[PDB]
């Protein structure tokens, strides 16, 4: 997606080397993770309050079983709304 190639620093045309990789789950599984969130697109900004209790729950509802790194850039979908994580 757009942010991923903007976090990986890619360019369609560049030749990457993709290789399977596996985690050490009993040392690497996530149990508590903080994220800095903000409106992905600044053209659709609102002042509405948004329930984090429902956003983290929708976060795990969608981003279960996925690989996440420190400093990684991604998008969050709350009611089809793009946020920038």
Partner 1 sequence: KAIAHYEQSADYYKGEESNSSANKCLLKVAGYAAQLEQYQKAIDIYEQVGTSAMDSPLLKYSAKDYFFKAALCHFCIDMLNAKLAVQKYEELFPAFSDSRECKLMKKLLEAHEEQNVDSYTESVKEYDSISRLDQWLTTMLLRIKKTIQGDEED
- CB 59, min distance to partner 1, A: 21
- Residue 19 dihedral angles phi and psi, to the nearest 5°: -140, 140
Please identify, using beta-carbon distances, which residue of 38 and 51 lies nearer to partner 1. Answer: 38
Positions touching partner 1 (CB under 8 A) are: 2, 41, 43
Distance CA 19, CA 45 (A): 39
Closest CB 43 distance from partner 1, rounded Å: 6
CB-nearer residue toward partner 1: 25 or 42: 42
Q: Return the beta strands (E) in 1-85 as ranges.
A: 38-39, 75-78, 81-84
> Minimum CB separation from partner 1 for residue 82, in Å?
8
Q: Which is nearer to partner 1, 3 or 58 (CB)?
A: 3
């Amino acid at each position: 997606s757009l942010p991923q190639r903007k976090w990986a620093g890619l360019s369609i045309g560049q030749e990457i080397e993709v290789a399977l990789y596996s985690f050490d789950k009993a040392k690497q599984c996530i149990g508590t993770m903080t994220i800095e969130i903000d409106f992905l697109q600044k053209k659709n900004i609102d002042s509405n309050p948004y329930d984090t209790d429902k956003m983290a729950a929708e976060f795990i509802q969608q981003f279960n079983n996925q690989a996440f790194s420190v400093g990684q850039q991604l998008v969050f979908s709350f009611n089809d709304k793009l946020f920038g994580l």
